[PDB]
Design a protein around this ligand. Structure first.
Ligand SMILES: *[C@@H]1O[C@H](CO)[C@@H](O)[C@H](O)[C@H]1NC(C)=O
Lengths: 126, 183, 184, 126, 184, 126
């Protein structure tokens, strides 16, 4: 068999049949926001019984924002440790220095790409 | 010419899906890929078929993104792609795909993988021009175990005010490009 | 095996730009190359006459050269602004713009028939750049029973203030293009 | 014969000779602003006499402006010709609606292209 | 022998900063023979820190110039490109025509430049920043050895700097075409 | 020998060795702003002694600014009279005319290109 398993990261490819036969193959693709990394499977088959083979959406990962170098004379630490869309980045300035412009940046998802909600701040010399 | 051109063909039928959720083809994508040395020459224009698509330019800004995926052979995976009709020669298609060493498949999207430029939309009433931001991502992002090559076209409207006030056939000026091809 | 159709490198005054003129006042360099189902284009323009080389003392000007061809693919030198036939680098039909791709219309005037882009003019005094709007109409509109193919080039100046204050050789940056070609 | 006939829509191609000979052909092309439609004649020929054959500029039509869809909740009706340059377009708003911005647009000829002298109006809901 | 290039994904192969001894740029160049023309593909990647800091300014400029001998071979000594080009398998066939883009002693023909725009993708939000690209063909020469020349010049100029910290400079691929020599 | 001679127009090509052998050759290239004209020498060699051969930077000439046509109803005369960077251009307006905007323009060197420090003036009719 029946409707193939549903997942969080990947979805089905093509019209969902009410009944699948033994032997036939069903394929998945990553959902909007996720991307695929080899070589874990993205498909599954109807076994000699009438259940589906094992299968996980581990092949699909959450989109990531670009790496951010510590501001000069500063320090850029992920506030959740992730670079995964949804989580943010915290900025701290060293001794004898002060930050200018947004000590926190969000990693938001815009379309199919994950980007930062701003330009990394500066650490100024006091 | 010994198989030189891979294209959608001249003046094609509705052959792709532009609107997010639907199953009826609402776009006429003209794509022409030509082998030339170590490079491929590209020609790509778009035409709107559906009403919902031809209304997109009544907004101050819109965005259209068609992505094509290919197997290891170089054949359109029609299921995953926004392009719903396989490419054909003018007479493997691997020779036409974007080199994997040139524009890799990554696990984070090299700026080195995008092509960027500008094509234009002609208004309905006074033929005046409106810049559309075109951008072509080569490979870089795979969504299935089948995918071996990928080309993504993204048109972007963004203007002080909307180009159209009523619905009218969306058409993007031909945008030419080139990339280092597989072999 | 006959790959290039062009005006030739560094040509003589070979076209009329000023409407109703007595002499060729433009040096049009055009290079059309066969490549698969496409043609690669290269087109630059140089001003010869004084009246033409004064055009850019205005805030805005416009230049439009149109080439017509017979069923064979040969320049109809009489109707065209280009007054010297094209030649191979060694039918020219193979080089013309496909009729199915860019039709000849009697009503609509397809937006699908234009190519649009931007090339540049270098000023005389400080070499600075001034954007010119280039637009190439393929086929679309015939004006005579002889016409079977048509290419129209249109350069457009439009700036907050004029580029030049005196007369100076008008030269358009090379603009590259491509179109779906006819095929015997 | 002598100078070939002159017309409104089409003009002569090439230097006008003071004297043409019997059987000699002369070709016309449409003037700036007009465009040609098959398969009518666009030439004449010096007959066994010393007059020119019949010939008209019917082969040449006026440049047309783009089609204009009825404004939503409105109605776009032309005033005269097939969107031919020179003639204009009238706009009327349905019941319970009112127009904003120019209930008439001209189809003027600018250069070699025929265009509308404005953006089609809106029909508003009252 | 159809393609002349630097090769795909090359090693640090050119010098961008004045007075260095360590290649700090990865220039990808692909030149393809096509009829009477050459098709061009050129992207740039920053290697050194000093180079990858250039875009913390409101504006910067990068100029790589390649010189060639009469054979069509890179004069690696005079050029900013420090590694010879190679075929994909004379290179004279690939050089810019001398009659099309002459070597002048008087002026610098505006007819010798190609002009366009490619783009830089920011580090944090992937947004786009226009870079002015300009390619001078031949025209000037700084050695008795020089017989052909190609000069690439990228130019940043924005209301405010794209980056606030150091980040890998990468120019969008810019495509071009020129009339090529032809040995003969 | 030792470090090869230095010049204004041309510079050395390659790493300057502290000691050059006897008979070893050294090449020069024109500096940013200058360009080469045949067939004068660009090189020098270490003679049977331990000095360098004669050699000048005459092979390298200064970058020139673009030609400037006499303003309409005026006259554009080079004042130092070179067009090479460094020297300037004077503007004089004819009888019954007056100049607007900078009667002198400098030909300055910016980068590798020599350009004019302004837009040529106008000669107005009074
Ligand atoms: C990310 O970390 C910060 C720490 O300041 C926290 O406020 C925020 O809620 C975290 N985000 C999520 C989704 O947990």
């Amino acid at each position: 068999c029946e409707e193939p398993p549903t997942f969080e990261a990947m979805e089905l490819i093509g019209k969902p049949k009410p009944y699948y036969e033994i032997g036939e193959r069903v394929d998945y693709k990553c959902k909007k926001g996720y991307f695929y990394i080899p070589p874990l499977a993205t498909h599954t088959i109807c076994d000699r019984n009438h259940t589906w083979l094992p299968v996980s959406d581990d092949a699909c990962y959450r989109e990531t924002c670009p790496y951010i170098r510590d501001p000069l004379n500063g320090q850029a630490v992920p506030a959740n440790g992730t670079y995964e869309f949804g989580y943010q980045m915290h900025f701290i300035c060293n001794e004898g220095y002060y930050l200018i412009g947004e000590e926190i940046l969000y990693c938001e998802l815009k379309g199919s790409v994950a980007i930062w909600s701003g330009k990394p701040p500066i650490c100024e010399k006091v | 010419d010994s198989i030189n051109t891979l294209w959608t063909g001249i003046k094609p039928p509705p052959n792709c899906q532009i609107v997010e959720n639907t199953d009826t083809n609402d776009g006429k994508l003209t794509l022409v890929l030509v082998k030339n040395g170590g490079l491929v020459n590209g020609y790509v224009s778009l035409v709107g078929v559906s009403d919902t698509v031809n209304q997109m330019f009544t907004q101050k800004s819109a965005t259209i993104q068609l992505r094509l995926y290919f197997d290891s052979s170089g054949n359109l995976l029609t299921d995953e792609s926004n392009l719903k009709i396989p490419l054909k020669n003018k007479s493997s298609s691997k020779a036409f795909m974007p080199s994997t060493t040139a524009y890799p498949f990554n696990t984070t999207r090299d700026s080195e993988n995008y092509i960027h430029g500008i094509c234009y939309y002609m208004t309905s009433y006074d033929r005046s021009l409106v810049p559309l931001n075109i951008s072509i991502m080569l490979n870089s992002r795979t969504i299935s175990s089948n995918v071996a090559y990928a080309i993504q076209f993204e048109w972007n409207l963004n203007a002080k005010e909307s180009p159209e006030s009523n619905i009218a056939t969306l058409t993007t000026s031909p945008f030419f490009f080139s990339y280092i091809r597989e072999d």
